[PDB]
Design an enzyme around this catalytic site. Structure first.
Site, PDB file in Angstrom:
ATOM      1  N   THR A 130     -57.313 -54.198 -31.192  1.00  0.00           N
ATOM      2  CA  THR A 130     -58.150 -54.407 -29.758  1.00  0.00           C
ATOM      3  C   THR A 130     -57.836 -53.127 -28.849  1.00  0.00           C
ATOM      4  O   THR A 130     -56.912 -52.415 -29.537  1.00  0.00           O
ATOM      5  CB  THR A 130     -57.166 -55.402 -29.053  1.00  0.00           C
ATOM      6  OG1 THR A 130     -57.668 -56.803 -29.404  1.00  0.00           O
ATOM      7  CG2 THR A 130     -56.828 -55.268 -27.635  1.00  0.00           C
ATOM      8  N   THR A 131     -58.359 -52.989 -28.053  1.00  0.00           N
ATOM      9  CA  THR A 131     -58.161 -51.740 -27.316  1.00  0.00           C
ATOM     10  C   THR A 131     -57.166 -52.043 -25.974  1.00  0.00           C
ATOM     11  O   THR A 131     -57.011 -53.242 -25.417  1.00  0.00           O
ATOM     12  CB  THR A 131     -59.485 -51.121 -26.632  1.00  0.00           C
ATOM     13  OG1 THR A 131     -59.266 -50.259 -25.478  1.00  0.00           O
ATOM     14  CG2 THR A 131     -60.535 -52.243 -26.174  1.00  0.00           C
TER      15      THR A 131
END
Lengths: 102, 242, 250, 233, 241, 198, 243, 244, 244
Positions: free
Chosen positions: H31-32
């Protein structure tokens, strides 16, 4: 020098009937000539229909009751919720006490 | 090489599976539970006529209400029996009562996965899994007569009847048909004697096979050669009967 | 974490060779030449200060080290290894000897201690042998002057004179020709300087050569006076100047 | 490829995967199905007990950790014993030392962290079991999904095991429905049995084959087996 | 520190290190043991790869664990010492706590346990040794003979052999030993023992040592002559036909 | 304390040891043998602290027997005594020392001479013609200093002890219930069952 | 066999590949540094390269203050550089505590070199892919420069350079000294020595520098400090009014 | 030869440590998450992929607090990230206990740094599979940091890692240029919400949940707190609006 | 992990042989030959120095014959350094025995102990065995003159005459050919030199390439004497026996 013990007074009484049993005890807790509490329960229901009281040095009595209750709890966890008979609890208590023989 | 506690791509523990292979090469062991007691029988399987067959101890006593039969690398079972015996006796010292059959079994299986070269979970110092399976049979006030199969995987199942060792798949199939909830102790004895005879390479006699049971009344008893010999005779007779 | 390398890194091959010791020896062969000559009243150890850059200060790097006031060492091979070996050697001279008997160890025993340290790095778990060969020269009251060689295997031997490293074969041969049991210390220093010249490619002077001796007691290097029995160290490193003077008589 | 990077958990593959962990996850899929779902007053565990022979028992899959917490397992039984025992201690410690019941959310964090350690050090092996934790704490009903990877997630409901995907889609559909089954345990249980059967195929949930557990507002975590579940088949 | 798992299962369910430990025993010199009706005899062969030894000092193949129990073996010599020492120590420890010397089955069970343990402990390889342990339980006269192997398995035999060509000599014993009538004498028991060894020793008066164990710590080893005499009378049994 | 005496004559060593075992106010046993045979030709008598006494004796016995079986040989009396001294010398500086005194009498088959060693709990060893531990020495050393001769026969030795035992029964405050006498010589160790009136 | 290249054991040629590859790592940051000695000071120059615009330029440094008197510039990956820095700081603090005087530059260098020598011989420890240049104005030796590598080697220098283009800087510095005939920059102020340093850094690398392309550390009697972008700017201006 | 990438502390011929590089892959696959340094604090925000409608919204929190003034967010193997925070928490407790003063951000950064670098020194451990963004307000200002599996870390104006680290960094760079005077805590929170919405395109397939937290000398008194309710919705909208 | 680099020095071959022991012996076979001959009035130990130079100091040298006790000595064949380690522990064991029993250690007990130490490196620990074989020459009042030999495996045996090192096969045949139970020390001294003289891989058998030792009970005394021959002494006995 530090004395690890104390005396919290109180008295307990246990009588066994033909199909019942009682464990009584005053609710007074003291230190020397002072009263710490006029109501501080000292006889306990530990489950599996077992009542117990460890009179004398309160901190010690509490730790013991606490340990035994936790004992009953684990007895269930390890023996398919089997009920802990009173004779078994007695033997169990012996080990709890003797473990601190020194 | 590769870790002793490594997982195969299918989600299996190599050493435990290979462990099971060794057990298949072991001598047959069968157990039958009935509302009258549990019967445990094993194939002695001496490797030479000069070997004194009765020094073959593949059925041992855990406690008076718990007996056990082994199959596979039997030398690996000594420390297990010791642990079990101690566990049973210890429980009785602490609680002034007999240890439940299930509890005793769970205790033995707790040793099972304690192997590796440094597995982060405690101090499992054992270079490999056990190379032997056990059938633990006993009786306790809470769940009456019981039979358990304890494997090197650490898991243990409860069986009405179970067979382990070289003739297991065959013998198990047999047990599937023959076992019913109302078998008598005698029926189970003959039944165990019968199935051993089918899977055993040798002609079953009271010297290359041994029986035993566990009953609430007299506990675990290992049948002496004479007692079994007659049961074997009684079996040949009922078979030739039809 | 935790060193899980508790097994040997040096083992026997089917042929009976111990690879790592062999390879360590190979490392020694690539090292700058060093040698030692024993005279009747002293010993001399010397080597080339192969400076790795003209910007480096070669003095701040002694290939020749004092172990005890009557024992010195020089080597050929992996410098870093030598350094820690000298640290250990100086310490074991105390822990295993001075602190017990109140006197410095005789050359053979200290050599034996060093050799032990090296042998262990040949069998202990998780390590490689030391990549060096040492030449230790010293003097003790009951054994006089001596010269020893300690190899990566931990084996050691006493010499009259010998060389190790790059052109050891050539130098050993040149020594066999000039050595005799009547050489005075100055004679050995001269023979030493000659042998070393054949091994040096470039500049050959008191700044590119490091040389030390085990000879007479230097009361001037003791640091104090007032105790007759304490006469000074026998180990002395020659100064750049002292070397050049002997080079003009080369 | 894979063969060179799956020798032990301490090795990363060139793509950033930890195969030993993935193979562990694989033991879960091969494990019997089990389902978890909760309303706002209760949380239920429905598990399909698997049996070896017809002469063998159907291996228990629900373990009680404390009066207010419990879980269901899918994968290596022993590993669930180890993990549940650890959770029993963490619960036990919380009470004895702080006289406080352990938050289901904290139990999850403790489980994740314990699993994680067995994935960064040499010599160990990941746990090969999946866990579904339900409990009623100071913030209501809760359901957690535990994976050997160390990942723990809180959900309204879910399922793990073989064909677990059936029950999972069903609950993702029934969501708005069961989440409102407050004050009625029998309905949540039924809604669970219906979710689990969505993963059957081989047989049909019998009496000594079905296992259910429940906890909530005024219900101490209790396990129902056999005759006790008859009224749900 | 070192704890690598050296004895582990292979795909087919075998512990190769324990298996290879047996190969070490197959290579060792032969050893045999036959129990009479009032004794047990232990025979062992002597190699000849090099002869110029000093038999007085060279360690013998039959060792006394206690005064009423002996142990012979086939396999790695160095390994046998370790087992013999532990056995001897346990023998004394048992007398110290039980106030009674060990039974042969007990001493056997112990040696076997040490061997078994070395098959599933890290950092160690199994004992490349198999033993024959014989003697008489305290205050008992019924002879005892047991055998142990690398795996840790043990059992009693009426007669048994281990080591190189033990295959051959076992056959001999299997068709030369009657449990119905075991060698009722020390003499005929020793004879049956040498005969079995001659099946493999190929004329070796100095390549065959024998030890006789009788009840109540009565243990003695025969001298070349005594043995050589049994060989002589045996070769005649053949020629007289 | 208990009576522990020893006397080395011409061809043997005689050891006399009291038979009583008293605890507080009661004499619990009157036939106690305060001795352990370490090897066929070596005997050890002991007296001291209640438990340490026998525990030590049996411990030493065990070790000597182990040595005997490992080497198929019997350590000389001198060697066995040196081993016992070191054991006690280690003990004195340990957490809880063995409070035991001993007399080691053995016949050295190699030298063909009897030997008597006296060793106290501190690990103090000395070889003597005659020795004693405890209060006995106070009345028996001067007795023997008077009536002892190196060439005495085993019989003269037994008469000598009898003389010691009589002095001990006249002047000692305690009733040690007689002694058990044992002879150690070239033929091993044997007990004189008739000393209750010899 | 083929593992004589994964751990620190000898190769048939008597070489230690891991140590060689560790040396390779020391250039991974593509930074060059040099150090020169003044009359009574020691200066260290090091290229400062901040690529990312999201980085806080103030936190990008390879120069460290090991102790009140010792400065150290690292050539290699920052994580190994920080590991070396913390250890050196610890080692220096302990030394003062146990021996009662400030750890000398050459001693800390030897100590760090010995620690490195160990990763060279024990298999479970990997070498650090860094080269440490230590500087100070020792109370006994005066201006000092001691550098250590992954081999556990160390020596003192009259001046030195490290990095990808180390050779060009070295020969440049060598030439200047062959000319001057002395083993140091004959300048009273450190400002001029810092200028000399930057000047030759430019000639040798054939590159111009802005106040944010360099990083400067100075060591004087009783103190080692680093310069600020502005202190450098002032230095860059000064050199500009000469060319 | 080859195989230089099978053991963790091994140097490859070109001086690299492949296992660490492979750890990075695990990070990029995650995930960012980002961090924006404002004029008196720092803001943290992360993407929370919604696997299914079964995930109880707002419950599976990711941002973690250390002590009372530090915030930590990471991308990659989540369990590894928790492990690293547990350590940081001890590291902080230890520091406070001896020095009294809660741990300075830089000091805390190195604690995490050294610990991570330590896991690239032996083959008996695996490097961390996470890049972590953390920061807070201390005795002298706000500090933002990002730490790689290599143990490398630096001070940042803005930082991002994970799937959409490029979109994020692109956005962050604009902000840095267009605000040389410094963004404000209130502003950064919004800006953050947007950057996540933007950087979510590289994963536009699955629906997500936003999570923001901050530490501002004026807005939170220098204590780390999670953005909730109104302030959260207000930032969610500011994003939903500029996404079209 | 580390498992990758473990040689497993203590495992069995499929034939039930110990690799390292077998390879160590192979190593021993290239070591200078050492011979031991036991006579009625004494024991002889002779060994050939492997590799020498004009400059080697033979006076201060010893690489094959070591004194363990005053009544026991050993001849070494193999890694000298490995030998010294074992020799030292052997010397300590002899003294513990003396301090304990106040009697010199019986020859076999010392030999067995040393052999047990070796046996150990064979069954556990993962370390390489010692590349050494010893010929023990001692005397005690229970077996008188004794000759023993121990090797890497940990096995030991007694002999009337024996050799270790290079060309043992050749040397044994030569010894087994001229040895006689009623020999005499002087006879053995000669038999020994002749044997070495015929098995040497060198040109001639000179004194500088030898070490000699005898353990005799000098009639004019009654005690046992160990004599480690000095260069000159070996040079003499060399001329006398007719090798000049």
């Amino acid at each position: 020098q530090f004395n690890p013990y104390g005396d919290n007074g109180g008295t307990i009484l246990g009588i066994a009937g033909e199909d019942f049993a009682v464990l009584a005890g005053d609710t007074r807790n003291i230190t020397d000539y002072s009263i710490n509490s006029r109501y501080e329960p000292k006889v306990f229901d530990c489950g599996d229909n077992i009542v117990m009281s460890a009179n004398g040095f309160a901190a010690d009595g509490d730790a013991l009751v606490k340990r035994f209750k936790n004992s009953v709890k684990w007895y269930h966890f390890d023996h398919n919720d089997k009920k802990l008979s009173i004779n078994s609890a007695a033997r169990n208590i012996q080990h709890l006490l003797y473990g601190k023989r020194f | 090489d590769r870790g002793v506690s490594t997982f195969s791509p299918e989600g299996r523990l190599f050493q435990v599976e290979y462990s099971l292979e060794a057990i298949k090469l072991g001598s047959t062991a069968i157990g039958i539970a009935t509302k009258e007691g549990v019967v445990l029988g094993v194939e002695k399987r001496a490797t030479s006529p000069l070997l004194e067959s009765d020094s073959i101890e593949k059925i041992v006593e855990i406690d008076r209400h718990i007996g056990c039969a082994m199959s596979g690398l039997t030398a690996d079972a000594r420390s297990m029996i010791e642990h079990a015996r101690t566990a049973a006796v210890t429980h009785n010292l602490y609680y002034d009562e007999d240890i439940n059959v299930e509890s005793l079994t769970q205790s033995v299986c707790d040793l099972a996965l304690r192997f590796g070269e440094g597995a982060s979970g405690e101090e499992r110092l054992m270079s490999r899994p056990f190379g032997v399976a056990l059938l633990i049979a006993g009786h306790d006030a809470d769940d009456g007569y019981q039979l358990f199969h304890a494997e090197p995987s650490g898991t243990f199942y409860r069986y009405n009847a179970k067979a382990i060792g070289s003739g297991s798949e065959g013998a198990q199939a047999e047990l599937l048909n023959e076992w019913h909830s109302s078998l008598t102790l005698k029926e189970a004895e003959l039944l165990v004697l019968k199935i051993l005879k089918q899977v055993m390479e040798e002609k079953l006699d009271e010297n290359n096979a041994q029986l035993s049971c566990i009953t609430k009344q007299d506990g675990f008893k290992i049948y002496d050669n004479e007692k079994t010999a007659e049961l074997i005779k009684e079996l040949k007779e009922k078979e030739a009967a039809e | 974490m935790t060193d899980r390398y508790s097994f040997s890194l040096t083992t026997f091959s089917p042929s009976g060779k111990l690879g790592q010791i062999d390879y360590a020896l190979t490392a020694v062969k690539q090292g700058v030449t060093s040698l030692g000559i024993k005279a009747t009243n002293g010993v001399v150890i010397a080597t080339e200060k192969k400076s790795s850059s003209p910007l480096a200060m070669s003095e701040t790097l002694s290939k020749v080290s004092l172990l005890t006031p009557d024992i010195g060492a020089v080597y050929s091979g992996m410098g870093p290894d030598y350094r820690v070996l000298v640290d250990k050697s100086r310490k074991v001279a105390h822990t295993s000897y001075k602190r017990i008997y109140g006197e410095y160890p005789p050359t053979k025993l200290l050599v034996s201690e060093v050799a032990k340290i090296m042998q262990e790095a040949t069998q202990s778990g998780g390590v490689r042998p030391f990549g060096v060969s040492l030449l230790i020269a010293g003097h003790d009251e009951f054994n006089g002057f001596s010269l020893y060689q300690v190899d990566p295997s931990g084996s050691y031997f006493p010499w009259k004179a010998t060389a190790i490293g790059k052109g050891s074969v050539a130098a050993k041969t040149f020594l066999e020709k000039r050595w005799n049991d009547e050489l005075e210390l100055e004679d050995a220093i001269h023979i030493a300087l000659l042998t070393l010249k054949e091994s040096v490619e470039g500049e050959f002077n008191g700044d590119t050569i490091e040389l030390a001796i085990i000879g007479d007691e230097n009361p001037d290097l003791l640091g104090y006076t007032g105790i007759p029995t304490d006469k000074g160290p026998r180990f002395r490193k020659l100064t750049s100047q002292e070397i050049n003077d002997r080079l003009e008589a080369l | 490829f894979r063969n060179n990077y799956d020798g032990d958990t301490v090795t990363f593959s060139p793509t950033g995967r930890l195969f030993q962990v993935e193979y562990a996850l694989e033991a879960i899929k091969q494990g019997s199905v089990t389902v978890g779902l909760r309303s706002n007053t209760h949380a239920v565990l429905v598990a399909l007990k698997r049996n070896a022979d017809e002469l063998s028992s159907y291996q228990k899959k629900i373990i009680k950790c404390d009066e207010h917490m419990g879980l269901s397992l899918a994968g290596l039984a022993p590993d669930a014993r180890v993990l549940s025992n650890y959770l029993r201690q963490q619960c036990n410690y919380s009470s004895l030392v702080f006289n406080r019941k352990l938050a289901v959310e904290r139990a999850g964090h403790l489980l994740c962290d314990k699993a994680q350690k067995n994935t960064q050090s040499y010599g160990g092996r990941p746990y090969g079991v999946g866990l579904l934790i339900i409990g009623y704490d100071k913030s209501g009903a809760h359901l957690l999904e535990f994976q050997p990877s160390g990942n723990v997630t809180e959900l309204y409901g879910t399922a793990i095991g073989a064909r677990s995907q059936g029950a999972k889609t069903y609950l993702e559909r029934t969501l708005d429905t069961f989440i409102k089954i407050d004050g009625n345990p029998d309905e949540l249980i039924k809604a669970g049995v219906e979710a689990i059967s969505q993963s059957l195929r081989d047989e049909s949930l019998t009496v000594d084959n079905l296992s259910i557990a429940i906890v909530g507002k005024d219900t101490p975590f209790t396990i129902y087996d056999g005759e006790a579940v008859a009224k749900y088949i | 520190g070192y704890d690598r798992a050296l004895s582990i299962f292979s795909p087919d369910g075998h512990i190769f290190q324990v298996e290879y430990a047996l190969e070490a025993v197959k290579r060792g010199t032969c050893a045999v043991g036959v129990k009479g009706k009032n004794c047990v005899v232990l025979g062992c062969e002597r190699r000849s790869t090099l002869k110029l030894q000093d038999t007085r000092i060279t360690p013998s193949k039959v060792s006394k664990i206690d005064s009423h129990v002996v142990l012979s073996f086939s396999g790695l010599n160095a390994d046998s010492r370790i087992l013999i020492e532990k056995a001897r120590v346990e023998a004394q420890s048992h007398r110290l706590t039980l106030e009674d010397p060990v039974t042969v089955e007990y001493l056997t069970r112990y040696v076997a346990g040490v061997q078994q343990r070395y098959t599933q402990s890290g950092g160690v390889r199994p004992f490349g040794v198999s033993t024959l342990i014989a003697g008489f339980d305290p205050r008992d006269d019924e002879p005892k003979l047991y055998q142990t192997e690398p795996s840790g398995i043990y059992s009693s035999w009426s007669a048994q052999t281990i080591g190189r060509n033990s295959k051959t000599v076992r056959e001999f014993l299997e068709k030369n030993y009657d449990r119905k009538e075991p060698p009722a004498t020390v003499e005929e028991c020793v004879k049956l023992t040498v005969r079995s060894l001659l099946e493999v020793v190929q004329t070796g008066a100095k390549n065959i040592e024998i030890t006789v164990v009788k009840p109540d710590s009565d243990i003695v080893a025969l001298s070349s002559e005594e043995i050589n005499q049994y060989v002589t009378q045996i070769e005649q049994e053949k020629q007289e036909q | 304390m208990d009576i522990i005496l020893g006397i080395r004559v011409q061809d043997s060593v005689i050891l006399a040891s009291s038979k009583a075992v008293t605890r507080g106010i009661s004499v619990l046993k009157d036939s106690d043998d305060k001795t352990r045979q370490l090897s066929p030709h070596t005997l050890m008598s002991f007296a001291g602290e209640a438990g340490d006494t026998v525990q030590f004796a049996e411990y030493i016995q065990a070790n000597i027997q182990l040595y005997s079986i490992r080497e198929d040989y019997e350590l000389s009396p001198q060697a066995v005594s040196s081993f016992v001294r070191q054991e006690l010398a280690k003990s004195i500086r340990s957490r809880r020392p063995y409070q035991v005194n001993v007399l080691i009498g053995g016949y050295d088959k190699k030298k063909n001479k009897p030997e008597l060693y006296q060793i106290d709990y501190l690990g103090t060893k000395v070889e003597l013609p005659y020795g004693a531990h405890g209060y006995s020495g106070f009345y028996t050393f001067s007795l023997l200093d008077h009536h002892y001769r190196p060439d005495m026969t085993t019989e003269e030795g037994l008469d000598l002890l009898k003389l010691c035992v009589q002095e001990l029964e006249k002047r000692m405050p305690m009733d040690f219930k007689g002694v058990i006498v044992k002879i150690v010589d070239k033929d091993g160790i044997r007990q004189v069952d008739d000393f209750q009136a010899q | 066999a083929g593992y004589d290249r994964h751990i620190t054991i000898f190769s048939p040629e008597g070489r230690l590949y891991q140590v060689e590859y560790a040396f390779k790592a020391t250039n991974q940051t593509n930074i060059n540094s040099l150090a020169v000695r003044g009359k009574d000071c020691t200066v260290v120059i090091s290229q400062k390269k901040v690529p990312d615009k999201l980085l806080d330029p103030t936190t990008v440094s390879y120069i460290f203050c090991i102790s009140r008197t010792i400065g150290m510039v690292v050539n290699g990956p920052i994580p190994d550089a920080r590991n070396a820095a913390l250890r050196a700081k610890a080692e220096a603090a302990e030394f003062r505590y146990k021996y009662g005087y400030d750890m000398p530059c050459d001693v800390l260098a030897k100590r760090m070199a010995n620690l490195s020598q160990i990763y060279t011989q024990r298999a479970y420890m990997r070498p650090l892919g860094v080269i440490l240049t230590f500087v100070s104005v020792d109370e006994e030796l005066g201006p000092s420069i001691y550098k250590t590598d992954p081999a556990g080697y160390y020596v003192g220098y009259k001046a030195t350079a490290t990095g990808p283009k180390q050779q060009e800087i070295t020969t440049n510095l060598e030439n200047h000294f062959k000319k001057s005939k002395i083993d140091h920059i004959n300048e009273e102020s450190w400002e001029k020595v810092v200028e000399f340093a930057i000047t030759h850094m430019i000639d040798a690398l054939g590159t111009e520098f802005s106040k944010n392309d360099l990083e400067v550390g100075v060591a004087t009697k009783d103190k080692f400090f680093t310069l600020s972008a502005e202190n450098i700017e002032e230095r860059l201006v000064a050199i500009a009014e000469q060319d | 030869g080859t195989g230089y990438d099978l053991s963790n502390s091994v140097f490859s011929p070109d001086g690299r440590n492949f296992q660490v590089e492979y750890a990075v892959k695990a990070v990029e696959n995650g995930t960012t998450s980002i961090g924006i340094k404002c004029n008196d604090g720092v803001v943290f925000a992360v993407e929370k992929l919604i696997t299914s409608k079964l995930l109880v919204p707002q419950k599976n929190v990711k941002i973690q607090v250390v002590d009372r003034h530090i915030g930590c967010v990471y991308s990659g193997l989540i369990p590894d990230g928790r492990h690293l925070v547990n350590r940081g928490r001890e590291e902080a407790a230890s520091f406070k206990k001896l020095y009294k003063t809660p741990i300075p951000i830089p000091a805390f950064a190195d604690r995490l740094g050294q610990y991570v670098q330590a896991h690239t020194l032996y083959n008996s451990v695996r490097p961390f599979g996470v890049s972590t963004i953390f920061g807070g307000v201390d005795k002298n200002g706000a500090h933002l940091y990002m730490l790689e599996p290599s143990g490398s870390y630096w001070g940042y104006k803005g930082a991002a890692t994970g799937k959409g680290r490029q979109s994020a960094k692109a956005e962050l760079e604009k902000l840095v240029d267009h605000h040389p005077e410094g963004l404000s805590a209130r502003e950064a929170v919004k800006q953050a919400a947007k950057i996540i919405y933007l950087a979510h395109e590289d994963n536009k397939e699955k629906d997500f949940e936003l999570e923001i937290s901050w530490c501002s000398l004026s807005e939170t008194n220098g204590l780390h707190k999670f953005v909730k309710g109104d302030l959260l919705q207000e930032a969610i909208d500011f994003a939903q609006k500029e996404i079209n | 992990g580390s498992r990758r680099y473990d040689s497993r020095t203590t495992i069995f071959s499929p034939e039930g042989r110990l690799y390292q022991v077998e390879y160590a012996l192979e190593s021993i076979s290239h070591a200078g030959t050492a011979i031991g001959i036991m006579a009625s009035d004494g024991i002889v130990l002779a060994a050939e120095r492997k590799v020498t130079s004009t400059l080697l100091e033979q006076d201060t040298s010893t690489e094959k014959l070591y004194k363990l006790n005053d009544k026991i000595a050993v001849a070494v064949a193999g890694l000298t350094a490995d030998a010294e380690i074992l020799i030292n522990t052997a010397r300590i064991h002899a003294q513990n025995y003396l301090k304990t029993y106040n009697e010199d250690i019986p020859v076999e007990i010392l030999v067995r102990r040393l052999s047990d130490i070796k046996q150990g490196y064979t069954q556990h620990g993962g370390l390489r065995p010692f590349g050494v074989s010893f010929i023990y020459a001692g005397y005690d009042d229970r077996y008188g003159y004794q000759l023993y030999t121990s090797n890497p495996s940990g096995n030991y045996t007694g002999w009337k005459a024996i050799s270790v090192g290079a060309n043992t096969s050749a040397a044994q045949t030569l010894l087994q050919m001229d040895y006689k139970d009623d020999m005499k020390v002087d006879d053995a001294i000669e038999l020994a030199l002749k044997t070495l003289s015929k098995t040497t891989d060198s040109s001639a058998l000179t004194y500088d390439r030898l070490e000699f030792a005898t353990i005799r009970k000098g009639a004019n005394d009654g005690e046992v004497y160990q004599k480690i021959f000095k260069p000159q002494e070996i040079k003499d006995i060399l001329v006398k026996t007719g090798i000049t």
